[PDB]
């Protein structure tokens, strides 16, 4: 027991961590000194709380590395409790925390302020009226929204109707005739220049006579 061992620091700091950092990325490295002789002198690395399940320590080199994927919408940050034991009896022990943020990145979907959106109009409308507005908000709170409709909406229904690519308000393009067409069902993808499948909505809109 001539001495134990002391970390070089009491808490180390590993700040902005990428969210969507892969498996087996270094987060942090932690020293812990004994200067003890041959196996008094030798530490064992250990997390005895707060990783969650996502970060290793390496019992000999110190290092720590994440061990599956992070979410910054699940969880912001960690603070993770560290023992070096000594590797002869009495096993003398040293503490340290580790404090990991998260930086969030864009990788989320997005929400849109309804289940659906409706519209009842009626024929010879005036061309630029407004009919009703699609809004939607990035779940990763970063990029504000680009509203379009989507590929599979009637050349029909985008002659007559036309979204903003900023308010994501919808106006009349063309000239509603109720002879031609009745009702609408248009759908509108937001998109937060990010990588998931496309956030859509429907928008259903009705003439009158
Ligand atoms: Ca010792
Ligand atoms: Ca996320
Ligand atoms: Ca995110
Ligand atoms: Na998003």
Redesign the pocket.
């Known amino acids: 027991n001539d001495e134990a061992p002391v970390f070089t620091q009491q808490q180390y700091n590993r700040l902005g961590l990428r969210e969507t950092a892969g498996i087996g990325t270094s987060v942090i490295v932690v020293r812990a000194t004994d200067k003890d002789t041959g196996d008094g002198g030798l530490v064992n690395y250990r997390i005895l709380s707060g990783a969650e399940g996502k970060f290793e320590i390496d019992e000999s080199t110190g290092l720590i590395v994440t061990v599956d994927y992070l979410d910054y919408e699940t969880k912001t940050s960690y603070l993770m409790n560290v023992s070096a034991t000594d590797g002869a009896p009495p096993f003398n022990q040293g503490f340290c925390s580790v404090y990991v943020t998260l930086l969030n990145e864009?990788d989320?979907?997005?929400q849109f302020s309804n289940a659906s959106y409706e519209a009842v109009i009626m024929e010879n409308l005036a061309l630029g009226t407004e009919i009703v507005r699609v809004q939607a908000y990035?779940?990763?709170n970063?990029?504000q929204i680009t509203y379009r409709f989507d590929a599979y909406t009637s050349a029909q229904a985008k002659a007559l109707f036309k979204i903003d690519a900023i308010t994501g308000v919808i106006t009349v393009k063309g000239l509603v005739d109720r002879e031609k067409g009745d009702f609408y069902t248009l759908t509108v993808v937001a998109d937060?220049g990010?990588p998931?499948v496309d956030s859509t909505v429907k928008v259903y809109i009705t003439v009158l006579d």
């Open positions: 864009l989320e979907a997005v990035d779940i990763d970063l990029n937060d990010g998931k």
